[PDB]
Amino acid sequence: QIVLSQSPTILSASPGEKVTMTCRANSSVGFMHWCQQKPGSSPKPWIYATSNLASGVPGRFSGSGSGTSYSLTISRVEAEDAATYYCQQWSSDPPTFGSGTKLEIK
Amino acid sequence: VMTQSHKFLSTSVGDRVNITCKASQDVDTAVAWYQQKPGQSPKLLISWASTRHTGVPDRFTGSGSGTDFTLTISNVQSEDLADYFCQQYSPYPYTFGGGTKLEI
Amino acid sequence: DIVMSQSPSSLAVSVGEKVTMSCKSSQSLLYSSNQKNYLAWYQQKPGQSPKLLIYWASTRESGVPDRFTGSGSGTDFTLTISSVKAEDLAVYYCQQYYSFPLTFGAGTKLELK
Amino acid sequence: QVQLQQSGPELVKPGASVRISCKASGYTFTSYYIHWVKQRPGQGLEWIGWIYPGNVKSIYNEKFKGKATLTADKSSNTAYMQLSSLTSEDSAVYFCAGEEHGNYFDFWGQGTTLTVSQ
Amino acid sequence: QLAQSGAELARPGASVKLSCKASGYTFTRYWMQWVKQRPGQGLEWIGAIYPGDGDSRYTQKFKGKATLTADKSSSTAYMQLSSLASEDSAVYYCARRNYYGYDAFAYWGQGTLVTVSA
Amino acid sequence: CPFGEVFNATRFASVYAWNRKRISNCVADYSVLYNSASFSTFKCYGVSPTKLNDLCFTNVYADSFVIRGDEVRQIAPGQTGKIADYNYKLPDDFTGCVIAWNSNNLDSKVGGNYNYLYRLFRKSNLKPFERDISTEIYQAGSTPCNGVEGFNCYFPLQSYGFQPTNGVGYQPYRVVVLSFELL
Amino acid sequence: VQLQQSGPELVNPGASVKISCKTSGYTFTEYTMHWVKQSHGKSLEWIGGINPNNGDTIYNQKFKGKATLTVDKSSSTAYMELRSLTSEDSAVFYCAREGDYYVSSYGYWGQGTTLTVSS
Ligand SMILES: *[C@@H]1O[C@H](CO)[C@@H](O[C@@H]2O[C@H](CO)[C@@H](O)[C@H](O)[C@H]2NC(C)=O)[C@H](O)[C@H]1NC(C)=O
Ligand SMILES: *[C@@H]1O[C@H](CO)[C@@H](O)[C@H](O)[C@H]1NC(C)=O
DSSP, X not given: OOOEEOSOOEEEOOSSOOEEEEEEESSOOSOOOEEEEOTTSOOEEEEOSSSOOTTTSOTTEEEEEETTEEEEEESSXXXXXXXXXXXXXXXXXXXXXXXXXXXXXX | OOOBSOSEEEOOSSOOEEEEEEOSSOOSSOXXXXXXXXXXXXXXXXXXXXXXXXXXXXXXXXXXXXXXXXXXXXXXXXXXXXXEOOOOOXXXXXXXXXXXXXXO | OOOEEESOOOOOOOSSOOEEEEEEESSOXXXXXXXXXXXXXXXEOSSSOOEEOOOSSSOOOSSSOOOOEEEEETTEEEXXXXXXXXXXXXXXXXXXXXSSSOOEEEEXXXXXX | OOOBEEOOOEEEOTTOOEEEEEEOOSSOTTTSEEEXXXXXXXXXXXXXXXXXXXXXXXXXXXXXXXXXXXXXXXXXXXXXXXXXXXXXXXXXXXXXXXXXXXXXXXXXXXXXXXXXXX | OOOBOOXXXXXXXXXXXXXXXXXXXXXXXXXXXXXXXXXXXOEEEEXXXXXXXXXXXXXXXXXXXXXXXXXTTTTEEEOBOOXXXXXXXXXEEEEEESXXXXXXXXXXXXXXXXXXXX | OOTTSSSSOSOOOOSTTOEEEEEOSSOOOOOSTTTSOOOSXXXXXXXXXXXXXXXXXXXXXXXXXXXXXXGGGGSSBSOOSSSTTTTOOBOTTOOEEEEEEEOSTTTOXXXXXXXXXXXXXXXXXXXXXXXXXXXXXXXXXXXOOSSOOOTTOOOSEEEOOOOSSSOSSSSOEEEEEEEEEOO | OEEEOOOOEEEOSSOOEEEEEEEESSOTTSSOEEEEEEXXXXXXXXXXXXXXXXXXXXXXXTSSSSEEEOOOSSSOEEEEEEOSOOTTOOEEEXXXXXXXXXXXXXXXXXXXXXXXXXX
16 A cells, blocks of 8 residues: 655646645655646656656656655746646555646646 | 668768667667778777777767667767768677768 | 378398388478478387487487488488398387477388298 | 557446457567556546556456456457446546556557446 | 788688687687678678687578687687678678677777689 | 666666676766665675775676575576576676665565566576577477477576565565676 | 386276386486377377476377376376276387487387276
């Protein structure tokens, strides 16, 4: 049993801002992958172990952390990041997704 | 197995030129790069595409990994005008890439 | 199945004559990688337990002195002994051992008088 | 290219069994895992289970043990999901997932959905 | 640290015993590796030997044709062509890897013109 | 300082296709080694294990794999076994340093990992440092077969099984060998 | 190496019989075994084989269900189990080894276990 938690479940972000969204987890876990799901379509692989960017992603996205809490920082928010960000977890237990963050522009 | 980009390659003196080898299957960073002056025998210049060899200037920077390897010769002098090679080291046979001749 | 047969069914040969033995396979038992045939020959008297004396393909085995020789490839194969001795009076089988139904037939020794 | 193309959207009566196809292509089918993901509408994703198609050995979630059974036919490069005893609450969208490196889904699949009809 | 070789002009039916004299290292533990080079069409790998033991390796287009041997006492390695033709008129090198096993061809010998038209 | 992509890498390869990375033109720190002590085995031959940043070599070749815990002793000069005679054999005059630590929270999954293959049967023993990636059929029996994988026709890469609910004898150890050379 | 069978058996029709192939002189788990059936002077068929390392069996299509091959590893003794004998299984049985290297599917044969059907 490993269960995650993404505490900022809805985030507002004006363009040209630095927004950091976090992933809190039960106990310990290793590296923490990420994923992005556009509303109404198949999701896309976004971030590898903590900080590699899946070879098809603009370089604004950068995440880091260690221990139990892992977080993702977008450098400059644009119009294209109107999607939900999920997370897997690389550990011995099977991959249980978190809740998510919805990132809306105001 | 390998393949190459340009069979012939034209540059001026100060220009920067990239030579690319695209491998068909996966080679986990084990290619190497040879130059061959038209008289003598080809010598080793870049191996494990990031790493350079001894006796080689810092001008030659090969880079890339995965299955796309690239050699960026920075400031091609009047000396470094010869063809260039590729390789693979993991599967048998160690089949070479084609030549790619550099010229003015 | 892979079926083989001896076209010489009877020898009828006395002491000291040139003999041949032949078997014809149904399909080719040439392993294309190592370029080896896979046949074998072995002798037995009508009383005792047989014993193998030919290796991978028409080769020899350390044992009885190899006066006999075999040869061939593909489908048609040979086994020849130059002179009949006292230890040559025995029935010889042609065995296929390439494809896994290992079937083999008989080729019978007889004597002339 | 590497792409896991799925079937069409399916609608069945409650109580029936559902077979989901997952045509893998482009990569070596007998080395990468195949996972399965459930997305209820308006909600987050949930894990179902995986089936390593070389040596078939399935693992299921604790809340998905009697409804979902997975088979992986090796020589066709297609995995399968036998969803059984279907009720109205299991009306959602189902993708595939492939992975090698531990839990990181390399190639997801386009959305095929499964719903009940009345 | 350097290889040394010979030269040859031969007949289209004959057989050639080339050479690669090795010097300066332990010939028992490294692999000797032979490549060929036609004028144009890039390089090509032929085969290799382990002069400590005699465990030769080959390529399927070049197995049976070149019968590589080695001799521990004289500190050299021999390749033996067979059924030469107009396509085999090329240049034949020998190369030792840098660190034995799985590495790069760091030491190359001078070319042996083998011209076997007629 | 190129000792930062060798140890803390994402996924090591198998034992049969043991990956190599070349290290050159930078004196390493050797600070995580023999001063962090989170590793299990530091059986380090030749050179002293405490004097590494003072000394300098010609070539620094590193390679890595993942083995079961009962096979961590096989990465050794000449100690025969199952992986040291078909997968990865050190030579008898190897100098360098052998590193090993536990990996169960990264490489194990509930239901087997099934992706850390190891080579079972080969026609002869291995040479020092010779690696083979081919998956050719061993054909232990009399007959040859055309890769059909039948009676006495094996797939030579047996697959490890890795679960977190095991002992210490069955747990993948991330083992990295350091090979150095003087001239 | 020398490879010994058991004595001659006289078996009632439709019975389970165990033929013992006791051997020594070599490590038993290294080479295979085989069993053939010489039907009173014409060695036409083969029953099957069994690898001592893995216990894997493979039988001819002529003898399916009526032939079973089971060999334990510790005693270095082979065993063949014939179930439901009929009037067609009146023959002698040899047990075989596989060469000195993996060169020939037969070699170092045994004596002849003469199994007739005693009605
Ligand atoms: C691999 O990553 C670990 C992560 O913990 C590194 O551990 C370092 O530990 C010391 C302990 O005092 C810390 O001061 C460092 O900040 C940690 N570094 C990092 C990257 O977090 C370990 O050194 C790394 N090893 C390498 C670089 O191979
Ligand atoms: C949190 O993880 C621990 C194991 O470290 C587990 O025992 C516990 O049940 C988990 N929490 C939940 C999901 O209740």
